[PDB]
Amino acid sequence: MKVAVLPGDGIGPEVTEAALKVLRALDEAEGLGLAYEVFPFGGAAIDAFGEPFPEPTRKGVEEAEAVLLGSVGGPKWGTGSVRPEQGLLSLRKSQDLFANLRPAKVFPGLERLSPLKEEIARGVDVLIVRELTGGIYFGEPRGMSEAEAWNTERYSKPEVERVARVAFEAARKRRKHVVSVDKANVLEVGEFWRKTVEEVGRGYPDVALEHQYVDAMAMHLVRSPARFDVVVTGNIFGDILSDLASVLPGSLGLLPSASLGRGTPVFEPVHGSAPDIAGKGIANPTAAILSAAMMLEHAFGLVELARKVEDAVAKALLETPPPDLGGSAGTEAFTATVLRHLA
Amino acid sequence: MKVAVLPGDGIGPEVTEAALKVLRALDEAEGLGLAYEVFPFGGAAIDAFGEPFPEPTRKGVEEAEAVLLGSVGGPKWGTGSVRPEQGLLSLRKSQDLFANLRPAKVFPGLERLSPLKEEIARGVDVLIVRELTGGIYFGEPRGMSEAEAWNTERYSKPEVERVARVAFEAARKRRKHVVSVDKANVLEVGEFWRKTVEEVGRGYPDVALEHQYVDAMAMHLVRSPARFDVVVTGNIFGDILSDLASVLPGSLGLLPSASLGRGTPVFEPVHGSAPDIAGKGIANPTAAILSAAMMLEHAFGLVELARKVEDAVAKALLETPPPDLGGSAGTEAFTATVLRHLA
């Protein structure tokens, strides 16, 4: 289990270490053969090397089986050419990560934080898989003039095929149900997407496949989000649907995410670097611990342990809620109870 | 007040008449000079004339100042070339209706029907204005092959200008706040849309204008929908955002809609024809009465009376809820109390 750790800026070092404390505990208990090394990334890298993704780090992520990312960014680098964020872009490109996984889960007992009535928020555990490299965001031709502007939603068979496969594989480890979202009833691209996913699906007889229009899906995620498992769609649709789903739990700080592709996969919390809270303790490590769980599941296929970590933090959230959840548990405090439920 | 009434199929004649009872009551009380004529439309027209939008009806809507539409469709015409729905298409095209208005309002006391927690559902009263004729749905070039498929999101200055103006005019009659939604941070079309609406806005100093990304807007409509008034966006974004907003009240049957443009405006309930309920009474006329209110407001500028009708049905909903709201008030019963609060 060769893991490249990139703590990053602000609260990154603190939350990342909390994840490591959980990973080390599991390693003792199960002998996972964990081997990790921490590398400079983000603003810290700019300040120490001049660039956000220095040579030693690039080589380090390339030699690893997975990447545990902290957080990047800060007002100190809101000026200049070299921005901490280009580091994310370079990391993603260097490994050809083409799929973005964003889970939205309403942990039992925490239905009160959801914008939805508790009856409907209960049981939500959906995973949005978004195509990251193609679509209208990168399509040609594109342009603008005084009189008009245009952008192209384009997709080739291979692009749809690969993202679809990660959705199916992801589904096998969950509740084996996938819903591909398109706009097949009006757009050629939609029809193309649908028929391609229907074809790819033939090789996964153990997983159920359903199709939905993006407009209907927007309604479903608000009326009955609990009925879904894995959702796969294009770049722009995945962007919109990911954000919509992200508000379901009622606290962005609890969200982890992952980017899968041809190279080393990346796991990272969704929240920002929160530099004014750095070093005080208090930072909520939930998202980073949940990213570690995502790593165990997607990078190593250790689904059972990932679920073990998940239940652990679920209990911890009710038991010693972090400040951001109206509680007073500090970073170490919260992690301690997670560890206690991991025994 | 020359109104063309097109009752349509199923429950259309019943709900439409209920709206007429409200309009006639106001006419007596305020002397609006109401003059309406009913024409054949939809399946009834196919059965009586062979087409859903017969000559006498086309001439009738052309001579009128507004159209009150009932409902169209039914299993009897799910076969054949001539479908009741092409009638909607022809109507819309004949009058060059380029903007679709879809309100989502959570009537006080009915927060319990919303999928959202009552604290957040309370006070929702948003109007989505969607561009209907352009965008990716009709953009060129478009196509599909064995290897790829493409569709173009294209917009010319005039298209953005007209839809934007209806949003501003609509806003003046409400809370004078407009939020234009785009994808300006990634797409040329988004940037073009934004700069065009910012320019058009200069001629409406009395209305506040704000801009939002579609992905952020999806979150806002679920986390804090009560903070919006008028929302204007492109075809596809408006489609998605209209449906998302439509689930906010928790009952599609209460929703009215309107299509504005160069010709005679169309007002119609969002719900279907519900043919198995036809003639029994029981049909909820709320959406049709609210369409009549939309007519008063948008076609005749009688904002004060529209609000008067709105408050009337709001009270009626709490007082004698229709069956679809767990009550037992039939069509005539519900209308009677609406009329009583209109005095």
Report on the structure:
Two copies of one chain form a homodimer. Chain A has helices at 12-30, 43-49, 55-63, 86-94, 118-121, 157-172, 188-201, 214-223, 235-246, 286-298, 303-319, 331-340; strands at 2-8, 35-38, 66-71, 97-105, 125-131, 143-144, 148-156, 177-182, 208-213, 230-233, 256-261, 266-269. Chain A has 343 residues and is α/β, with parallel strands linked by helices. Chain A has one domain (1-343): Isopropylmalate Dehydrogenase (3-Layer(aba) Sandwich). Chain A has a ten-stranded mixed β-sheet with strand order 2-1-3-12-11-4-5-10-8-9, with helices on both faces. Chain A has a two-stranded antiparallel sheet with strand order 6-7. In chain A, strand 11 (256-261) and strand 12 (266-269) form a beta hairpin. Chains A and B meet through strand 6, strand 7, helix 7, helix 8 and helix 9 of A and strand 6, strand 7, helix 7, helix 8 and helix 9 of B.
